Symmetry: C2
């Protein structure tokens, strides 16, 4: 026995807030964690 004691965590989530809305009700594809990808898609081409 290591112990009888545990440290879990609480929930995670994602809600359609920033541009995920616009990509769902105008476009069809809605990227999970879009804006962190969407910036970095504007970041890689200048490296």
């Amino acid at each position: 026995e290591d112990t009888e004691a545990d440290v879990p965590v609480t929930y995670g989530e994602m809600v359609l807030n920033g541009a995920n809305l616009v990509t769902a009700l105008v476009m069809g594809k809605a990227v999970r964690s879009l804006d962190d990808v969407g910036r970095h898609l504007l970041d890689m081409q200048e490296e």
Copy 2:
């Protein structure tokens, strides 16, 4: 009634910038001027 005044500049520009470009390759979606129509439809979302 001759010699009028028109635009010499050829008519404007559509570029697939970060509004389009993110939606372009990731979902395959394209919206002409996604800037305002994303903005306005985010604001009418909050009325």
